Design a protein around this motif. Sequence first.
Motif, PDB file in Angstrom:
ATOM      1  N   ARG A   1       0.787  -1.212   0.000  1.00  0.00           N
ATOM      2  CA  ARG A   1       0.000   0.000   0.000  1.00  0.00           C
ATOM      3  C   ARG A   1       0.838   1.290   0.000  1.00  0.00           C
TER       4      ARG A   1
ATOM      5  N   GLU B   1      -9.987  15.069  -7.389  1.00  0.00           N
ATOM      6  CA  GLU B   1     -10.586  15.418  -6.106  1.00  0.00           C
ATOM      7  C   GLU B   1     -10.736  16.931  -6.015  1.00  0.00           C
TER       8      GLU B   1
ATOM      9  N   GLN C   1     -20.963  12.410  -0.219  1.00  0.00           N
ATOM     10  CA  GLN C   1     -21.082  12.017   1.182  1.00  0.00           C
ATOM     11  C   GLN C   1     -20.983  13.217   2.147  1.00  0.00           C
TER      12      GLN C   1
ATOM     13  N   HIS D   1      -5.310   6.737   0.069  1.00  0.00           N
ATOM     14  CA  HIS D   1      -6.498   6.958   0.885  1.00  0.00           C
ATOM     15  C   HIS D   1      -5.989   6.921   2.331  1.00  0.00           C
TER      16      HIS D   1
ATOM     17  N   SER E   1      -4.928   6.668   6.104  1.00  0.00           N
ATOM     18  CA  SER E   1      -5.179   5.555   7.000  1.00  0.00           C
ATOM     19  C   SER E   1      -4.090   5.464   8.080  1.00  0.00           C
TER      20      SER E   1
ATOM     21  N   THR F   1      -8.881  15.449   8.712  1.00  0.00           N
ATOM     22  CA  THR F   1      -8.446  14.095   8.427  1.00  0.00           C
ATOM     23  C   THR F   1      -7.216  13.740   9.275  1.00  0.00           C
TER      24      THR F   1
ATOM     25  N   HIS G   1      -8.397  12.828  12.533  1.00  0.00           N
ATOM     26  CA  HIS G   1      -9.136  11.565  12.479  1.00  0.00           C
ATOM     27  C   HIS G   1      -8.128  10.417  12.622  1.00  0.00           C
TER      28      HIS G   1
ATOM     29  N   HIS H   1      -7.027   7.197  15.653  1.00  0.00           N
ATOM     30  CA  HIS H   1      -6.712   5.782  15.598  1.00  0.00           C
ATOM     31  C   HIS H   1      -5.396   5.488  16.310  1.00  0.00           C
TER      32      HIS H   1
ATOM     33  N   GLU I   1     -13.470   4.948  15.091  1.00  0.00           N
ATOM     34  CA  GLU I   1     -13.658   6.047  14.152  1.00  0.00           C
ATOM     35  C   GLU I   1     -14.000   7.392  14.791  1.00  0.00           C
TER      36      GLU I   1
ATOM     37  N   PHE J   1     -23.965  13.207   6.022  1.00  0.00           N
ATOM     38  CA  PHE J   1     -23.245  11.941   6.002  1.00  0.00           C
ATOM     39  C   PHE J   1     -24.062  10.740   6.510  1.00  0.00           C
TER      40      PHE J   1
ATOM     41  N   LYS K   1     -16.527   3.733  -4.641  1.00  0.00           N
ATOM     42  CA  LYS K   1     -16.292   4.199  -3.281  1.00  0.00           C
ATOM     43  C   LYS K   1     -15.204   3.335  -2.632  1.00  0.00           C
ATOM     44  N   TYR K   2     -14.051   3.952  -2.403  1.00  0.00           N
ATOM     45  CA  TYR K   2     -12.901   3.280  -1.824  1.00  0.00           C
ATOM     46  C   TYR K   2     -13.260   2.061  -0.981  1.00  0.00           C
ATOM     47  N   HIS K   3     -14.017   2.283   0.087  1.00  0.00           N
ATOM     48  CA  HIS K   3     -14.404   1.209   1.004  1.00  0.00           C
ATOM     49  C   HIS K   3     -15.096   0.005   0.377  1.00  0.00           C
TER      50      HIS K   3
ATOM     51  N   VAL L   1     -13.976  -2.695   3.357  1.00  0.00           N
ATOM     52  CA  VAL L   1     -13.919  -2.095   4.690  1.00  0.00           C
ATOM     53  C   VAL L   1     -15.347  -1.776   5.137  1.00  0.00           C
TER      54      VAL L   1
ATOM     55  N   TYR M   1     -18.610  -0.257   6.575  1.00  0.00           N
ATOM     56  CA  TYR M   1     -18.937   1.159   6.616  1.00  0.00           C
ATOM     57  C   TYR M   1     -19.837   1.648   7.752  1.00  0.00           C
TER      58      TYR M   1
ATOM     59  N   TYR N   1     -18.809   4.194  10.463  1.00  0.00           N
ATOM     60  CA  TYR N   1     -18.838   5.647  10.336  1.00  0.00           C
ATOM     61  C   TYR N   1     -20.174   6.226  10.773  1.00  0.00           C
TER      62      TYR N   1
HETATM   63  N1  LIG Z   1     -11.053  12.034   1.589  1.00  0.00           N
HETATM   64  C1  LIG Z   1     -10.278  11.327   2.664  1.00  0.00           C
HETATM   65  C2  LIG Z   1     -11.140  10.798   3.684  1.00  0.00           C
HETATM   66  C3  LIG Z   1     -10.318  10.272   4.964  1.00  0.00           C
HETATM   67  C4  LIG Z   1      -9.862   8.892   4.905  1.00  0.00           C
HETATM   68  C5  LIG Z   1     -10.410   7.879   5.869  1.00  0.00           C
HETATM   69  N2  LIG Z   1      -9.745   6.533   5.741  1.00  0.00           N
HETATM   70  C6  LIG Z   1     -10.232   5.304   6.504  1.00  0.00           C
HETATM   71  C7  LIG Z   1      -9.321   4.089   6.125  1.00  0.00           C
HETATM   72  C8  LIG Z   1      -9.707   2.783   6.798  1.00  0.00           C
HETATM   73  C9  LIG Z   1      -8.864   1.585   6.459  1.00  0.00           C
HETATM   74  C10 LIG Z   1      -7.709   1.725   5.623  1.00  0.00           C
HETATM   75  C11 LIG Z   1      -6.907   0.590   5.308  1.00  0.00           C
HETATM   76  C12 LIG Z   1      -7.257  -0.695   5.823  1.00  0.00           C
HETATM   77  C13 LIG Z   1      -8.412  -0.838   6.655  1.00  0.00           C
HETATM   78  C14 LIG Z   1      -9.206   0.298   6.966  1.00  0.00           C
HETATM   79  C15 LIG Z   1     -10.206   5.631   8.002  1.00  0.00           C
HETATM   80  O1  LIG Z   1     -11.275   5.466   8.654  1.00  0.00           O
HETATM   81  O2  LIG Z   1      -9.170   6.064   8.522  1.00  0.00           O
HETATM   82  C16 LIG Z   1     -11.914   7.630   5.519  1.00  0.00           C
HETATM   83  O3  LIG Z   1     -12.207   6.757   4.641  1.00  0.00           O
HETATM   84  N3  LIG Z   1     -12.896   8.331   6.123  1.00  0.00           N
HETATM   85  C17 LIG Z   1     -12.770   9.381   7.166  1.00  0.00           C
HETATM   86  C18 LIG Z   1     -14.170   9.776   7.430  1.00  0.00           C
HETATM   87  C19 LIG Z   1     -15.079   9.093   6.673  1.00  0.00           C
HETATM   88  C20 LIG Z   1     -14.343   8.095   5.763  1.00  0.00           C
HETATM   89  C21 LIG Z   1     -14.658   8.420   4.297  1.00  0.00           C
HETATM   90  O4  LIG Z   1     -14.150   9.322   3.716  1.00  0.00           O
HETATM   91  O5  LIG Z   1     -15.487   7.578   3.808  1.00  0.00           O
END
Ligand SMILES: NCCCC[C@H](N[C@@H](CCc1ccccc1)C(=O)O)C(=O)N1CCC[C@H]1C(=O)O
Length: 598
Positions: free
Chosen positions: A29, A128, A243, A315, A317, A342, A345, A349, A373, A419, A473-475, A480, A482, A485
Motif C-alpha cells: 500500500r 478530487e 457524502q 487513501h 489511513s 483528516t 481523524h 486511531h 472512528e 453523512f 467508493k474506496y471502502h 472495509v 462502513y 462511520y
Molecule cells: N477524503 C479522505 C477521507 C479520509 C480517509 C479515511 N480513511 C479510513 C481508512 C480505513 C482503512 C484503511 C486501510 C485498511 C483498513 C481500513 C479511516 O477510517 O481512517 C476515511 O475513509 N474516512 C474518514 C471519514 C469518513 C471516511 C470516508 O471518507 O469515507
Amino acid sequence: IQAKEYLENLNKELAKRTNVETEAAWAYRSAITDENEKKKNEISAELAKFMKEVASDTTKFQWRSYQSEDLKRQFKALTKLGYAALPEDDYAELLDTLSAMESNFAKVKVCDYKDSTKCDLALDPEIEEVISKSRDHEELAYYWREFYDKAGTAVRSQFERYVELNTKAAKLNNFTSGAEAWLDEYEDDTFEQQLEDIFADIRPLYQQIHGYVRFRLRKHYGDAVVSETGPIPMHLLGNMWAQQWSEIADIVSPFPEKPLVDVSAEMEKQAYTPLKMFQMGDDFFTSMNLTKLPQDFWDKSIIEKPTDGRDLVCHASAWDFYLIDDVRIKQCTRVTQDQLFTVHHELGHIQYFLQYQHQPFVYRTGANPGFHEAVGDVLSLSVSTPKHLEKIGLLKDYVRDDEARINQLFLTALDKIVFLPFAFTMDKYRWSLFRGEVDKANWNCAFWKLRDEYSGIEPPVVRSEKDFDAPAKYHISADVEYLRYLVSFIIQFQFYKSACIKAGQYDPDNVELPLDNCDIYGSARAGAAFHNMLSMGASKPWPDALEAFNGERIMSGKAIAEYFEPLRVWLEAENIKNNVHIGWITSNKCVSSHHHHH
Ligand SMILES: NCCCC[C@H](N[C@@H](CCc1ccccc1)C(=O)O)C(=O)N1CCC[C@H]1C(=O)O
Ligand SMILES: [Zn+2]
C-alpha cells in the motif's frame, strides 16, 4: 485446567505474526507492485493456515463452560475465524479478487477535460480538486462519468465473486451471511434497529438541508440543471460520492456576506506544511494529558505523497504494527482545513493504538468499530470551532454576529448530518447482497435506488445494469465495513458533549458557552475520560467502554440534535420564507440502456 497460560502464549504469537503481515500490507500500500502484492497475500495465506490449526487446538479447552469470563471472551474471539475459516483454494482466490479491486481503485487515471493528451490525473490530488472547485456542471459530469467507469464498472466481475466468497466464509463461521457477521462486532441483536430509529429522528432535519441545498444550487446553476422536487444531481455537491457537501459552501451558505470559516487560505499563506499539521494534532493530544506520538511514528510515517512515479494507495489511513510504539500513518496530506480534520481523524486511531497497546493481542482493537472512528473526530469538532481557530491564529478577526453562527452550524451540517444517510446506505446495500435479497440483474439499480431513497441524490447521467457503481467508493473496493462511520458520527457527539462538560466549556443553561463552540483543547479531565475508555480496548463489550467515559451505556442522539438545534429552527423558518420544496420524487437515473445510432 488453565488455558490462561495458553492464551497468553497464543496472543503473543499472533501479535508477532500479525506484525509480519502488517509490514507486507504496508509495503504494498506504499508501493504497489506485483511483487509486493504477492508477498502480501502470501503472508496472509500462511497466517490463515496457522489460525485453522489454532482453531482445532481450542477444541481441547472446553471454554464454553468456563468460569472467569475474560478467558471465555478471548476464546470466543480467537476461534471466530473470519475469511480464514475458508478452504485454502478459496481463501487464495479471495485474496486475489480483493487485490484486483483494491489495486484497480488506486490505479485509476483519467484524461484532463481540457487536454485529451495529459491522462495522468488521479483521484487523490487532481480529480478530487476539480470536483471541489469547479462550477461547470458539464465539467463535473465529465469527471464523474470518467471516474465511475474505471473505479466501479471495471470490477463488477471480481466484486460478485467477492460477495460469493464472503457469504461462504460467513456460513462456515455459523453466521447467516457476511451481513450478520459484521453486525456481530456491535454485540447487540437490536443494533440495526437502534440505528434505524436514530436515523428516523434526524431525517426530518436532513430534509430541511436537502431542500435548502437543492434550492440554492437551482438558483445558482439554473432550472434546467437542477430541478425542484427532483433528486439533487450529485456532482454539484462538491464530493465524488456526495457524502459531504461543505466543499460547496461558497455558493450554498445562509449568509454569503458573513464569514465562512475557510482556514485553507490562511494555512497556505502562513506556510503551513503536512509536518506542521501533524505536530498540531500531536499537541492537542498531549495538551489533554494523552500520549505523545512515539519516535517510530515520525521516522516511519509517510505524510506527503511520494514524488516518484510509483503507484500507491493514498487513501489516508493509520497502522498498528502490534509491537510497542510502532505506529504509523500514511496520508497524501495537502494544506487545507479538510485535510487538517483528516489528520486528527487518523491520530484518533493512533492514540487508540497506544492507549490499549498493553492489552492481550485479541483485545488490541477498538471497543465496537464505531469507537475507533470517533476518537479523532471529537478533536476535529473542537478544532473546527471559531474559538479554537482564533486561539491558534488561523482566523485573524471574527465576530459571532448571530447570523454568522448559522454559517458555522450549517457548514457543519454539510459534513455531519448529510453523512448519516450516506453511510447507512453503503452498508444497507452490501447487506442486501450478503443476504441474498437482490437479484444479480438488479445489482446496480438496487444501489442507486437506495442512494435515492435515503439521500435524495442521483447520478449526473443515466446509468444501467450494464454499469456497476458501488466500487467507485474506496471502502466498497477495499472491503472495509462502513456502518462504523454511521455509529461514529452519532456517538462522537456523545463523546464531545461529555468531554466539553468535564471541561468547563459546556453549560446547557449558560449562554456564551454553547455546545457548538467548546474547545476542550488542554483539558485534563476530558483526556482522563478518554484514557479510561481507550485503555480498555475491546476487553469488554462497548457499553462498559462508554460507561467508563461518562457513566452512560446507551447509543443515542441526545447530542447532534442538541448541537444542531439552533440550526434546525433557523431552517424551518428560512425554508418557508423562500417557499422551499421539501422531499423528492423517485429518480429516473437507473435504467437498462438506450442509443440513437444504427
Ligand atoms: N477524503 C479522505 C477521507 C479520509 C480517509 C479515511 N480513511 C479510513 C481508512 C480505513 C482503512 C484503511 C486501510 C485498511 C483498513 C481500513 C479511516 O477510517 O481512517 C476515511 O475513509 N474516512 C474518514 C471519514 C469518513 C471516511 C470516508 O471518507 O469515507
Ligand atoms: Zn478512520
